[PDB]
From TrEMBL, chain A:
Name under which the protein is recorded: Small ribosomal subunit protein uS4
Source species: Leishmania major
Family (UniProt): Belongs to the universal ribosomal protein uS4 family.
InterPro entries: Ribosomal_uS4 (IPR022801), Ribosomal_uS4_CS (IPR018079), Ribosomal_uS4_euk/arc (IPR005710), Ribosomal_uS4_N (IPR001912), S4_RNA-bd (IPR002942), S4_RNA-bd_sf (IPR036986)
GO MF term list: rRNA binding; structural constituent of ribosome
Domain RNA-binding S4 residues, every copy: 106-179
Automatic annotation (TrEMBL), chain B:
Protein name per its UniProtKB record: 40S ribosomal protein S30
Naturally occurring in which organism (per UniProt): Leishmania major
InterPro entries on file: Ribosomal_eS30
GO cellular component: cytosolic small ribosomal subunit
Family: Belongs to the eukaryotic ribosomal protein eS30 family.
Automatic annotation (TrEMBL), chain C:
GO cellular component: cytosolic small ribosomal subunit; nucleolus; ribosome
GO molecular function: structural constituent of ribosome
Source species: Leishmania major
Protein name: Putative 40S ribosomal protein S23
Family assignment from sequence similarity: Belongs to the universal ribosomal protein uS12 family.
Automatic annotation (TrEMBL), chain E:
Keyword Membrane: no
Keywords on record: Ribonucleoprotein, Ribosomal protein
InterPro entries to which the protein is assigned, alphabetical: eRP_eS24_sf (IPR053709), Ribosomal_eS24 (IPR001976), Ribosomal_eS24_CS (IPR018098), Ribosomal_uL23/eL15/eS24_sf (IPR012678)
Pfam name, any one: Ribosomal_S24e
Highest taxon above the source species: Eukaryota
Signal peptide coordinates: none
Gene Ontology molecular function: any one: structural constituent of ribosome
Any one Gene Ontology BP term: translation
Spans annotated as Disordered: 102-130
Name of the protein in question: 40S ribosomal protein S24
Basic residues: compositionally biased ranges: 107-130
Annotated family: Belongs to the eukaryotic ribosomal protein eS24 family.
Transmembrane regions: none
Length: 183, 58, 141, 71, 130
RNA sequence: AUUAGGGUUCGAUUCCGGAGAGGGAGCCUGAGAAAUAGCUACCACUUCUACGGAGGGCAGCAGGCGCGCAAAUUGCCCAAUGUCAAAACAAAACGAUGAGGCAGCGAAAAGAAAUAGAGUUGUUUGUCAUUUCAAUGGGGGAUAUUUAAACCCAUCCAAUAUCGAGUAACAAUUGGAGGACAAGUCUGGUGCCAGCACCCGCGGUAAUUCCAGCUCCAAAAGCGUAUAUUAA
């Protein structure tokens, strides 16, 4: 009551619940990127739909339109920093051609797996959720963290993690404590 | 003729459920399904896949 | 054919207002006769008292007896017939029992081969009928 | 407005005819608004004449305008 | 690899400002404690800040609102340094002074005060406030 | 809310404007009231009484009782945000405030996210049986931190000196497998019965449809159902 904190939704379910082709493609994506459920794919779908709707509205307007200029520059910038679009292509019609894998590549789990800090995409999610990966000296625990191209270089193991400058984990800590108990 | 209610449910011989090991629950189950359907079975396209194929009977 | 004048907005408004009453759904929604005749009075569920237990013969080509209860709603005191939605669940219902009944799923229309039944029992004695059927709960007293 | 009735004493009824745009049908419809206006004896308007009226304080339970010029 | 090292605390101040109205200096205190087990005590932060700013008395520094950054290693909070302990005691809120140890004794229950006032509302003089 | 567009539906409810304080009416005071934690009187209801008399007004907050399909604590505090005031703060020396904030309850709704990960060996892969190996929570604590105080969060498990997974039992559910509609000519029961089935239909004995087991499917910390409403 008398609270003005805003909240909205980020995903939307498909119109047809059971399509063989859609289910097969979504299972492809889930297995390829190690996703807990289809709701992550649907969230990416909603982000893509919003971006493409904005791009269509801007492309309807004439080129000299100040609104088109400002918002197209903003969307170009956002795509380029977040890595969805290659820097070579700078037209407003390349946002319309974006696909779900383009954003799914930018997730911190996929980025860690590709960079080699993890042996698999299911290993990368565990590594992130277990406070082992730090992006630019900041521990990131969210697998869906979309990585900027400038922050791609700074991804490494956390200084507080055992796979780094931190103290030994539970397996070793508990074994050492048991050895002390025996001695 | 309300005296026959529950007839078949009461006549059904009770069979207890078998105890099986716990299945993966989170994204591990999605991984299991993906490896089973798209990785382990590499059947060529054009042939119908059966997600539940059964031994012949009757 | 219709009017296409530049200043014919009044004619088009009157035409649409007149012709919207021929839509059965629109008229039913915008007229109080349906809500007056609805025993639930526009509610999703309603609570009643089980007057008696009866068996309704299914219509052809089907052939069976469907377990229903004649109940009296506590807010309008109107008699309705409500189907018991599983097998052996009629044994969970006694006379003068405090029951909760919902619609059958067709918005005031008879469902299935049961001739004139549009309601079903969802709760009995403040315990879910499906829970009792699945043995996840026990009927008090 | 245009003079509609001159049967009262020192008072006239004027009609303001306009077209109202109904958005849904993208078309207009003709509407009117009658107004009670006080006409000074300096003017002698006839029914159908065109007048300019200016808003003043309530002079009666319906009169809020005064005739300023007859066209 | 992990090399054992004594825990070190580094104090830093940002958005510094001095107002002569309240006779104090306000700033945001950010502390770096790379290898530190737990959260840095406010008393220790106060002593380090007093030493850093060369204030005559460590009890004329008042610190509050310390939030620990996610992932560890830093906390950030607000701090004030008063011209004297008299100014600190005069201008500091009662709860902060209670944290520092100078606070007033807790008042009786507001419920009891309300009941006493409502009972007195029916009485004449010298029968109320007895 | 939903909608390509045009539309369709919803708005008791946080901000604004109106109205009211059981119902009517009348009023006094005051800059401002036709005021109701003002007054007066009627009419409903009510409470006390020593029977003469005297009272009441939760559509404030908490909380009852009804009524229903349907909705939380007789909590803590003015620390903040404001209001009033004769009033900065402090000093014998802390103004009120159910406004408001804080917590309790709270799968209305929204966001992020667990329920394992890397291998060995045997049994292209894959599977299965082994065999490892670390990691990390849930949780348990604290020099503490937060907070009006608590509480959450965050931080940590030595800094000299800090607990903890293996059936990681710390064991996922809700609906389904004739079609629409993803997924069984499987196996037992039953035999137009019991049932099921939005609709089409299934059950009259070799049930793809019921009651079960096993298996598979879909969504998933959610998933059914009813009734509305938008799209279709
Ligand atoms: K609350
Ligand atoms: K009475
Ligand atoms: K109340
Ligand atoms: Mg109402
Ligand atoms: Mg009023
Ligand atoms: Mg009332
Ligand atoms: Mg009044
Ligand atoms: Mg009151
Ligand atoms: Mg009254
Ligand atoms: Mg669990
Ligand atoms: Mg349905
Ligand atoms: Na209001």
């Amino acid at each position: 009551m008398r609270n003005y904190n805003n909240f909205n939704r980020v995903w939307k379910a498909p119109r047809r619940p059971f399509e063989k082709e859609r289910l097969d493609r979504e299972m492809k994506l889930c297995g390829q990127y190690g996703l807990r459920c289809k709701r992550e794919i649907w969230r990416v779908n909603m982000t893509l739909s919003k971006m493409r709707r904005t791009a269509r509205l801007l492309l309807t307007l004439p080129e000299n339109h100040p609104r088109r200029l400002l918002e197209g520059s903003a969307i170009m910038r956002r795509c380029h920093e977040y890595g969805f679009l290659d820097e070579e292509k700078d037209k407003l019609d390349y946002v319309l051609s974006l696909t779900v894998p383009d954003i799914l590549e930018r997730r911190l789990q996929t980025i860690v797996f590709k960079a080699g800090l993890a042996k698999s995409v299911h290993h990368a999610r565990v590594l992130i959720q277990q406070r082992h990966i730090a992006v630019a000296k900041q521990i990131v625990t969210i697998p869906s963290f979309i990585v900027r191209v400038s922050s791609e270089r700074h991804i490494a193991f956390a200084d507080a993690s055992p796979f780094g400058n931190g103290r030994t984990g539970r397996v070793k800590r508990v074994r050492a404590k048991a050895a002390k108990r025996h001695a | 003729s309300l005296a026959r209610a529950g007839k078949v449910k009461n006549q059904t011989p009770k069979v207890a459920k078998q105890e099986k090991p716990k299945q993966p629950r989170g994204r591990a189950l999605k991984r299991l399904k993906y490896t089973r359907r798209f990785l382990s079975k590499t059947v060529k396209p054009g042939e119908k896949v059966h997600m539940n194929k059964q031994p012949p009977g009757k | 054919t219709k009017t296409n004048g530049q200043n014919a907005a009044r004619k088009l408004v009157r035409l649409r207002c007149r012709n919207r009453w021929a839509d059965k759904g629109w008229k039913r929604a915008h007229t109080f006769s349906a809500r007056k005749a609805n025993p639930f009075g526009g509610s999703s569920h309603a609570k009643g008292i089980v007057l008696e237990k009866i068996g309704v013969g299914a219509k052809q080509p089907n052939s069976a007896i469907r377990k229903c209860v004649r109940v009296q709603l506590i807010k309008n005191d109107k008699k309705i017939i409500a189907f018991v939605p599983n097998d052996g669940c009629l044994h969970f219902i006694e006379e003068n029992d405090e029951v909760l009944v919902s619609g059958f799923g067709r918005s005031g229309h008879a469902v299935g081969d049961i001739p004139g039944v549009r309601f079903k029992i969802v709760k009995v004695s403040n315990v879910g009928l499906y829970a009792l059927y699945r043995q996840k709960k026990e009927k008090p007293r | 407005g245009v003079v509609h009735s001159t049967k009262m004493h020192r008072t006239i009824i004027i009609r303001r005819n306009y077209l109202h745009f109904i958005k849904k049908y993208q078309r207009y419809q003709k509407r009117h608004k009658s107004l009670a206006v006080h006409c000074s004896p300096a003017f002698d308007p006839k029914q159908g004449d065109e007048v300019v009226i200016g808003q003043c304080r309530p002079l009666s339970k319906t009169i809020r305008y005064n005739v300023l010029e007859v066209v | 690899v992990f090399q054992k090292k004594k825990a070190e605390v580094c104090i830093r101040t940002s958005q510094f400002k001095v107002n002569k109205l309240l006779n104090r200096k306000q700033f945001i205190v950010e502390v770096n404690h790379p290898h530190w087990c737990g959260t840095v005590p406010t008393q220790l932060i106060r002593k380090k800040l007093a030493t850093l700013y060369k204030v005559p008395d460590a009890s004329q520094v008042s610190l509050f609102g310390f939030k620990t950054k996610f992932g560890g290693g830093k906390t950030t909070g607000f701090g004030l340094i008063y011209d004297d302990l008299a100014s600190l005691k005069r201008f500091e809120p009662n709860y902060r002074k209670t944290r520092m140890g100078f606070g007033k004794a807790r008042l009786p229950a507001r419920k009891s005060v309300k009941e006493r006032r409502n009972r007195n509302k029916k009485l004449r003089g010298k029968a109320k406030g007895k």
